Design an enzyme around this catalytic site. Structure first.
Site, mmCIF file in Angstrom:
data_model
loop_
_atom_site.group_PDB
_atom_site.id
_atom_site.type_symbol
_atom_site.label_atom_id
_atom_site.label_comp_id
_atom_site.label_asym_id
_atom_site.label_seq_id
_atom_site.Cartn_x
_atom_site.Cartn_y
_atom_site.Cartn_z
ATOM 1 N N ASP A 117 0.828 -1.203 0.000
ATOM 2 C CA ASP A 117 0.000 0.000 0.000
ATOM 3 C C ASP A 117 0.874 1.269 0.000
ATOM 4 O O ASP A 117 0.974 1.957 1.020
ATOM 5 C CB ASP A 117 -0.881 -0.073 1.256
ATOM 6 C CG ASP A 117 -1.902 1.044 1.369
ATOM 7 O OD1 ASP A 117 -2.047 1.867 0.440
ATOM 8 O OD2 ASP A 117 -2.576 1.072 2.431
ATOM 9 N N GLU A 156 -2.407 10.260 -1.326
ATOM 10 C CA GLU A 156 -3.631 9.470 -1.400
ATOM 11 C C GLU A 156 -4.268 9.306 -0.019
ATOM 12 O O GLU A 156 -5.494 9.374 0.118
ATOM 13 C CB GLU A 156 -3.361 8.113 -2.061
ATOM 14 C CG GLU A 156 -4.595 7.247 -2.294
ATOM 15 C CD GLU A 156 -4.996 6.396 -1.103
ATOM 16 O OE1 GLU A 156 -4.138 6.071 -0.259
ATOM 17 O OE2 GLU A 156 -6.191 6.042 -1.023
ATOM 18 N N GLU A 157 -3.430 9.085 0.995
ATOM 19 C CA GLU A 157 -3.910 8.722 2.321
ATOM 20 C C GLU A 157 -4.415 9.940 3.094
ATOM 21 O O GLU A 157 -3.930 11.057 2.923
ATOM 22 C CB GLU A 157 -2.805 8.033 3.128
ATOM 23 C CG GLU A 157 -2.280 6.721 2.543
ATOM 24 C CD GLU A 157 -3.179 5.508 2.760
ATOM 25 O OE1 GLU A 157 -4.327 5.648 3.237
ATOM 26 O OE2 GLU A 157 -2.736 4.378 2.437
ATOM 27 N N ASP A 211 -3.440 -0.924 -6.680
ATOM 28 C CA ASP A 211 -3.425 -0.564 -5.268
ATOM 29 C C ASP A 211 -3.527 -1.828 -4.423
ATOM 30 O O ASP A 211 -4.231 -2.769 -4.792
ATOM 31 C CB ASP A 211 -4.573 0.410 -4.959
ATOM 32 C CG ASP A 211 -4.375 1.202 -3.665
ATOM 33 O OD1 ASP A 211 -3.400 0.978 -2.925
ATOM 34 O OD2 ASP A 211 -5.231 2.072 -3.377
ATOM 35 N N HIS A 295 -3.526 -1.407 6.508
ATOM 36 C CA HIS A 295 -3.430 -0.341 7.518
ATOM 37 C C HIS A 295 -3.015 -0.810 8.885
ATOM 38 O O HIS A 295 -3.256 -0.132 9.882
ATOM 39 C CB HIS A 295 -4.697 0.528 7.525
ATOM 40 C CG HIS A 295 -4.765 1.486 6.354
ATOM 41 N ND1 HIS A 295 -5.599 2.538 6.306
ATOM 42 C CD2 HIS A 295 -4.020 1.521 5.183
ATOM 43 C CE1 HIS A 295 -5.410 3.198 5.142
ATOM 44 N NE2 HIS A 295 -4.440 2.578 4.461
#
Ligand SMILES: [Zn+2]
Length: 326
Positions: A117, A156-157, A211, A295
């Site tokens: 990721d 992105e995050e 992704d 995550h």
């Protein structure tokens, strides 16, 4: 409505060649990947180093590389962002766009590598450019109006709880920038006959967004009816690679089934969203379910599954070869 470009099936010879992997190929990919297996939070030195590595790598391959840099407000105050856009032949009207994000999540529990990721996707894009360079540079001379473009999105995050305002900083910025940058077919090289080109967005023929790749046995589905003809090529390529015995499996007579021959009803927010809203066709190569490590602090190098990565690399090489007729 049919796909705007007639999709010529890959010849057997080319399928087999693209599905060949060597000890130096695995080594090359892994050496590339090592550069990304570092925390790379927005605002950090390592993030800068990763950005510079992407840029240098592609400039060394004679691609046009642009940095779309800007400062944006976040829940953590002003932050710098830089998207990296590499284009093989800037003048070509149409782009096959492959994309991923290069920032890593700022995780409150500790240092987060984000191996799937999206360190692996980042490495896969560079690996494609490197491993296919000869064929890509030959393709660029054809004057056929099509080229390859790689987009490494920044930001992105989310910095805090995901929201429309706190996420997708780089992709929202770039989609707006390109939408507002007006152009026309007469200013571009060899646009397809029935093309409607009004701005830079329209030149993105399809965006294939990678992704959360690198975990064992991902399950992909077609997320968009608009790109079903393209998605079906991934299904077909995977099937052919299995038929040829070119996939790595734990046992003889097993087959990979990553690209399900089905669609799924699932809404995933990712870097494609700002482009989807501007009519860019999207193929979203993201697993459902997400990797178990998603995550968590366990999204690290050792939780990657190398045979899967190798298999994906073969599919992606064959796909690019088929689309660009390499
Ligand atoms: Zn993430």
């Amino acid at each position: 409505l049919k796909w705007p470009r007639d999709l010529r099936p890959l010849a057997h010879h080319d399928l087999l060649y693209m599905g060949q992997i060597s000890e130096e190929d695995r080594g090359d990919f892994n050496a590339t990947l090592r550069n990304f297996l570092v925390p790379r939070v927005v605002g950090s030195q390592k993030h800068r180093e990763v950005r510079e590595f992407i840029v240098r790598s592609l400039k060394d391959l004679d691609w046009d590389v642009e940095e779309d840099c800007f400062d944006g407000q976040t829940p953590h105050g002003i932050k710098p962002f830089c998207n990296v856009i590499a284009t093989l032949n800037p003048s070509a009207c149409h782009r096959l766009v492959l994309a991923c994000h290069y920032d890593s999540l700022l995780h409150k529990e500790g240092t987060f590598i984000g191996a799937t990721d999206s360190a692996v996707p980042c490495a896969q894009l560079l690996y494609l450019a490197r491993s296919l360079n000869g064929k890509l540079q030959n393709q660029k001379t054809r004057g056929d109006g099509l080229t390859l473009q790689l987009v490494f999105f920044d930001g992105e995050e989310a910095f805090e709880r995901w929201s429309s305002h706190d996420s997708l900083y780089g992709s929202r910025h770039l989609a707006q920038k390109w939408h507002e940058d007006r152009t026309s077919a007469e200013r571009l090289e060899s646009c397809l006959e029935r093309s409607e080109i009004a701005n830079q967005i329209d030149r993105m023929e399809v965006m294939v967004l990678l992704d959360l790749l690198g975990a064992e046995n991902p399950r992909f589905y077609s997320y968009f009816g608009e790109t079903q003809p393209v998605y079906r090529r991934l299904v077909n390529i995977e099937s052919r690679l299995n038929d040829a015995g070119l996939m790595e499996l734990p046992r003889r007579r097993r087959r990979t089934n990553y690209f399900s021959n089905s669609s799924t009803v699932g809404f995933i927010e990712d870097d494609h969203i700002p482009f989807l809203k501007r009519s860019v066709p999207i193929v979203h190569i993201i697993p459902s379910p997400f990797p178990d490590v998603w995550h968590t602090l366990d999204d690290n190098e050792q939780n990657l599954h190398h045979p899967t990565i190798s298999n994906l690399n073969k599919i992606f090489k064959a796909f690019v070869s088929e689309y660009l007729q390499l």
